[PDB]
Design a protein around this nucleic acid. Structure first.
Length: 120
RNA sequence: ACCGACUU
């Protein structure tokens, strides 16, 4: 049981017209529930970032730079393998816009995101 | 509008 989010978009990709799938992925993915593998934490897909790269660094002090591989490998020997594949972004606040986003956008790569169940 | 769970 349970499957990756990457499978879902891949399934839909080969099944539906890519250009309309661009719309569908937004309409389906935005709102559905996902759990992140590192602790099996719980999140929802609010936004999707296309062709995103593993070279993304995490802002702890805005200047501290560690990659997905650097960060995750020290936790577990898992290898990230997205590379130009979309990553899932969680949006701390819905569509109104406070301007100053104190918490930076949280981005979780596809395979580190799995379907929690509220996706049915 | 936290789909009935959360910091990257």
């Amino acid at each position: 049981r349970s499957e990756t989010v990457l499978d879902f978009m891949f399934n839909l990709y080969q099944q539906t017209e890519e250009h309309k799938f661009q719309e569908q992925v937004s309409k389906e993915l935005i709102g559905l529930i996902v759990l992140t593998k590192y602790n099996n934490k719980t999140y929802r897909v609010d936004d999707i970032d296309w062709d995103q790269n593993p070279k993304s660094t995490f802002k702890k002090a805005d200047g501290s730079e560690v990659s997905f591989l650097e960060y995750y490998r020290k936790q577990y020997n898992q290898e990230i393998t997205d590379l130009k594949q979309p990553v899932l972004v969680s949006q701390p606040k819905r569509r109104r816009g406070p301007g100053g986003t104190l918490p930076g956008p949280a981005m979780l790569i596809p395979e580190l995101c799995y379907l929690t169940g509220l996706t049915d």
